[PDB]
Amino acid sequence: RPTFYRQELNKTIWEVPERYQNLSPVGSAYGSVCAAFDTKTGLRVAVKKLSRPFQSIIHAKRTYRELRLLKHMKHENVIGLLDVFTPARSLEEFNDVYLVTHLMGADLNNIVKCQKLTDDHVQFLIYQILRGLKYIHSADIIHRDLKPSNLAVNEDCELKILDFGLARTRWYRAPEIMLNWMHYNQTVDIWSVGCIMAELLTGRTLFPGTDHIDQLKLILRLVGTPGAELLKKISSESARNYIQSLTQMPKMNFANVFIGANPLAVDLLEKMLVLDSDKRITAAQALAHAYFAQYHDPDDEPVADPYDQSFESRDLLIDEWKSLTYDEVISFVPPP
Numbered sequence: 001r002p003t004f005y006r007q008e009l010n011k012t013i014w015e016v017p018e019r020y021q022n023l024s025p026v027g028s029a030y031g032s033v034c035a036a037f038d039t040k041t042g043l044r045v046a047v048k049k050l051s052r053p054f055q056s057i058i059h060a061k062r063t064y065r066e067l068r069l070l071k072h073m074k075h076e077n078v079i080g081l082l083d084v085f086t087p088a089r090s091l092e093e094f095n096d097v098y099l100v101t102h103l104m105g106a107d108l109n110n111i112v113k114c115q116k117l118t119d120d121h122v123q124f125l126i127y128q129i130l131r132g133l134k135y136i137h138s139a140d141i142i143h144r145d146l147k148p149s150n151l152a153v154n155e156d157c158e159l160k161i162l163d164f165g166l167a168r169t170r171w172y173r174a175p176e177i178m179l180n181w182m183h184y185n186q187t188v189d190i191w192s193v194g195c196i197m198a199e200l201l202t203g204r205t206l207f208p209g210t211d212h213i214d215q216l217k218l219i220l221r222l223v224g225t226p227g228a229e230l231l232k233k234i235s236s237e238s239a240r241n242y243i244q245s246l247t248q249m250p251k252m253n254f255a256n257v258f259i260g261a262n263p264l265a266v267d268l269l270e271k272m273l274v275l276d277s278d279k280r281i282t283a284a285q286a287l288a289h290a291y292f293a294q295y296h297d298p299d300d301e302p303v304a305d306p307y308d309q310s311f312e313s314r315d316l317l318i319d320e321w322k323s324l325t326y327d328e329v330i331s332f333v334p335p336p
């Protein structure tokens with residue numbers, strides 16, 4: 001229906017509706033990105049042209065997964081889809097997929113710049129992360145790689161959780177992920193929030209490991225070696241015997257680690273940075289914590305519609321994944 005124009009960008013021919021003006025390259029894995037001006041909405045937007053979206057079953061399923069996820073995320077603190085389009089007029093000529101979202105200019109690293117933030121500022125940032133995480137977790141989604149480069153912040157200081165980094169590490173990963181534990185709790189993301197929050201308060205990386213083993217060494221020095229109740233839950237005979245062969249490190253007193261911080265911030269960090277994932281605070285519980293008193297609104301922390309992820313178990317042909325992807329493009333409804 002819209003009128004499309006062609007322009008060579010990022011060494012390929014882009015073909016976009018005329019509403020998207022002044023395409024300029026932003027960078028080029030999954031695809032190449034341009035910034036543009038959406039004349040229909042007056043928004044600066046980023047347009048991603050997926051690369052080789054249906055070259056293989058793996059590519060095709062990944063394309064479907066990404067479009068399904070972006071179409072489902074409708075929350076102020078999560079990246080959302082402004083538009084998705086293809087120049088194709090039919091399924092038969094469907095080969096290219098373009099995704100459109102708000103143009104973001106800064107991630108959390110750009111806002112922090114290795115500085116201590118004010119406590120009020122930390123409250124506001126962590127509150128928004130937890131608000132978005134409550135939504136994501138309510139859809140039975142685990143982020144699994146939350147970190148400052150995956151958190152965008154606009155000029156109003158509204159934060160959005162991304163599943164990508166902007167155009168130009170393991171320091172924020174939960175310990176069970178670095179041990180390939182599987183059976184991951186949604187609180188692997190809460191661990192990451194604790195690492196981020198600590199960094200916002202101190203201006204320093206909490207666990208700046210040099211490699212995988214160093215990362216775990218640094219974690220255990222803060223939170224201690226596994227206690228008795230955690231050791232009961234370790235089925236791996238190899239993990240058990242190695243853990244008990246280590247000298248016991250006590251859990252440090254967080255009040256004497258984050259000296260000068262808000263005692264409520266310290267209490268919340270103590271509830272996020274627990275080795276046992278079953279004992280970590282959830283996102284919804286964290287939002288009710290006294291630390292966020294000035295921002296918490298129990299009636300404006302919404303949850304997601306149910307999210308059907310049954311396609312993850314399916315082994316389909318390329319043309320089937322492509323057809324399901326085409327259905328999702330055709331059915332897309334722009335947000336208000």
Ligand SMILES: COc1ccc(OC)c(CCC(=O)Nc2cc(-c3sc(NNc4ccccc4)nc3-c3ccc(F)cc3)ccn2)c1
Nearest residue numbers: 027028035046048099100101102103104164165166167168
């Ligand atoms: C024109 O003003 C700017 C001036 C300077 C400048 O820095 C060079 C930037 C860059 C800011 C930026 O990168 N902004 C941005 C990116 C995305 C991304 S980044 C990605 N993948 N990662 C990836 C891809 C290629 C290269 C590096 C990293 N995907 C999407 C994305 C995801 C879904 C969509 F629907 C659309 C785009 C989304 C929104 N804003 C801008």
Ligand SMILES: CCCCCCCCO[C@@H]1O[C@H](CO)[C@@H](O)[C@H](O)[C@H]1O
Nearest residue numbers: 002003017018019020021038039040
């Ligand atoms: C001059 C720089 C680009 C300006 C905006 C082009 C906007 C296209 O906008 C679209 O144009 C279509 C054709 O008129 C109309 O049918 C649509 O209603 C209108 O939204």
Ligand SMILES: CCCCCCCCO[C@@H]1O[C@H](CO)[C@@H](O)[C@H](O)[C@H]1O
Nearest residue numbers: 070073079136141142143161162163
């Ligand atoms: C768009 C929604 C962002 C918040 C939800 C992230 C949900 C988990 O999204 C993650 O995205 C990564 C992208 O490389 C994938 O590699 C991971 O497998 C996936 O779990």
Ligand SMILES: CCCCCCCCO[C@@H]1O[C@H](CO)[C@@H](O)[C@H](O)[C@H]1O
Nearest residue numbers: 175176183184185233275276277278
């Ligand atoms: C030296 C061992 C260091 C890491 C101990 C990490 C314990 C994380 O916690 C564990 O996470 C598992 C996976 O979600 C859950 O199934 C367990 O019940 C939970 O206790």
